[PDB]
Amino acid sequence: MPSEKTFKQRRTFEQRVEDVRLIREQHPTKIPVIIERYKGEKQLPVLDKTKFLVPDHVNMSELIKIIRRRLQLNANQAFFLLVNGHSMVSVSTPISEVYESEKDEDGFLYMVYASQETFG
């Protein structure tokens, strides 16, 4: 059992763009998201999911709140997220504008998580 590849290495760009077509057709007023494990912090195993939709009227806090239930822990255990593998864990910006500022080549809010805040 290898299981050591990311969504960009597993799915092709066209396949990822094809998924955005259905996400906007079904949810024209929502924001798609693609979060995976951070390369610098490889402690947490593969999450239950890699792509999840989010309401455009929500903020980073609601997105982090969903990742808590997506994972099996809480704020006391460990919760650190960052975009492009080069950011901190900030929460307050509305996903509506945060997505437009952190979109991806295929149209997805690419981000990564970690169980700590140390460097490599």
From Swiss-Prot:
Changing R70A: Abolishes interaction with TECPR2. Changing H27A: Decreased interaction with Legionella effector RavZ. It is found in: Cytoplasmic vesicle, Autophagosome membrane; Endomembrane system; Mitochondrion membrane; Cytoplasm, Cytoskeleton. The precursor molecule is cleaved by ATG4 (ATG4A, ATG4B, ATG4C or ATG4D) to expose the glycine at the C-terminus and form the cytosolic form, LC3-I. The processed form is then activated by APG7L/ATG7, transferred to ATG3 and conjugated to phosphatidylethanolamine (PE) phospholipid to form the membrane-bound form, LC3-II. During non-canonical autophagy, the processed form is conjugated to phosphatidylserine (PS) phospholipid. ATG4 proteins also mediate the delipidation of PE-conjugated forms. (Microbial infection) The Legionella effector RavZ is a deconjugating enzyme that hydrolyzes the amide bond between the C-terminal glycine residue and an adjacent aromatic residue in ATG8 proteins conjugated to phosphatidylethanolamine (PE), producing an ATG8 protein that is resistant to reconjugation by the host machinery due to the cleavage of the reactive C-terminal glycine. RavZ is also able to mediate delipidation of ATG8 proteins conjugated to phosphatidylserine (PS). SUPFAM superfamilies: Ubiquitin-like. It comes from the Eukaryota. It is a lipid-anchor. A lipid is attached at G120 (Phosphatidylethanolamine amidated glycine). InterPro entries: Atg8-like, Ubiquitin-like_domsf. Most abundant in heart, brain, skeletal muscle and testis. Little expression observed in liver. 3 different light chains, LC1 (a cleavage product of MAP1B), LC2 (a cleavage product of MAP1A) and LC3 (produced by one of the MAP1LC3 genes), can associate with the MAP1A or MAP1B heavy chains. Interacts at microtubules with CABP1 (via EF-hands 1 and 2) but not with calmodulin. Interacts with FYCO1 (via C-terminus). Interacts with TP53INP1 and TP53INP2. Interacts with TBC1D25. Directly interacts with SQSTM1; this interaction leads to MAP1LC3B recruitment to inclusion bodies containing polyubiquitinated protein aggregates and to inclusion body degradation by autophagy. This is Microtubule-associated protein 1 light chain 3 beta.
